[PDB]
Swiss-Prot record, chain A:
The lineage of its organism: Eukaryota, Fungi, Dikarya, Ascomycota, Saccharomycotina. It is found in: Cytoplasm; Nucleus. The gene is MCM7. ATP 2 binds at R87. This is DNA replication licensing factor MCM7. Component of the MCM2-7 complex. The complex forms a toroidal hexameric ring with the proposed subunit order MCM2-MCM6-MCM4-MCM7-MCM3-MCM5; loaded onto DNA, forms a head-head double hexamer. Interacts with CSM1 and MCM10. Acts as a component of the MCM2-7 complex (MCM complex) which is the putative replicative helicase essential for 'once per cell cycle' DNA replication initiation and elongation in eukaryotic cells. Core component of CDC45-MCM-GINS (CMG) helicase, the molecular machine that unwinds template DNA during replication, and around which the replisome is built. The chain holds residues 601 to 791 of 845 of the full protein.
From Swiss-Prot, chain B:
Component of the origin recognition complex (ORC) that binds origins of replication. It has a role in both chromosomal replication and mating type transcriptional silencing. Binds to the ARS consensus sequence (ACS) of origins of replication. This is Origin recognition complex subunit 1. The N-terminus is dedicated to mating-type repression. It comes from the Eukaryota. Belongs to the ORC1 family. It is found in: Nucleus. Present with 3930 molecules/cell in log phase SD medium. ATP binds at R34, G56, Y57, G58, Y59, D60. Component of the origin recognition complex (ORC) composed of at least ORC1, ORC2, ORC3, ORC4, ORC5 and ORC6. Interacts with MCM10 and TAH11.
Amino acid sequence: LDIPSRDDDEKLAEHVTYVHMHNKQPDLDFTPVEPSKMREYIAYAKTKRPVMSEAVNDYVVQAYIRLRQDSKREMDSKFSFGQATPRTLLGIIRLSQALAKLRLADMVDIDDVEEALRLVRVSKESLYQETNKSKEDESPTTKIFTIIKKMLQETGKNTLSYENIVKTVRLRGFTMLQLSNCIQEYSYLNV
Amino acid sequence: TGNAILVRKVRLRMSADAIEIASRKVASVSGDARRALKVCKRAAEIAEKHYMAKHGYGYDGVQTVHITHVMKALN
């Protein structure tokens, strides 16, 4: 979907006109390959037949699982690509194998299959917004709170004597004055 | 007979920690005097019936109200 922007119609147009000026789109930093010898190297790569690496499998497998589950909770949702299939997994593997061909190496890299995943996901979310956010950076006391929450998952008590809490805080490195301040705040916050 | 006069001179403590936790819980959702008074009364009478049962005075050393009483009465 071609979002009508401004920097695109600037740069793209400028550079097409620059092609009219200089018939090479390659700018100062570029190594364009003539299609003949390009083809030569490409076929040479095609004559390799690399092998799938044993380590990445799990990761690959896990990727599939992820790419599966979300799909279900995305069936009727916005990005209606429905129920990614085992053929998607196989296509990911094939993409990784071809990238390894580009490496001219017989063992697929974890970076290789990771790049393949990047390709398959960049196909997605390219519809709208194309943005995300981050909130969990600060965490000067909220981190203590989350540690407490894990502890509550363990037992779930709002006790009046904190000895494992202070131990885990000291292990976390956070000081005891900030810890006591936060304890004040949350007791006042009624937890 | 289990009669009380404000034969042993007993004392009673109303542990303010249970009072604290009840106040905290009520102030959380509602913060109502009626609800708090009544839940305090409820835990009180629960402890009362337990103490009565433990000695069987019928109806004709030191006492307290543990946190567990108010825990039950509030839950």
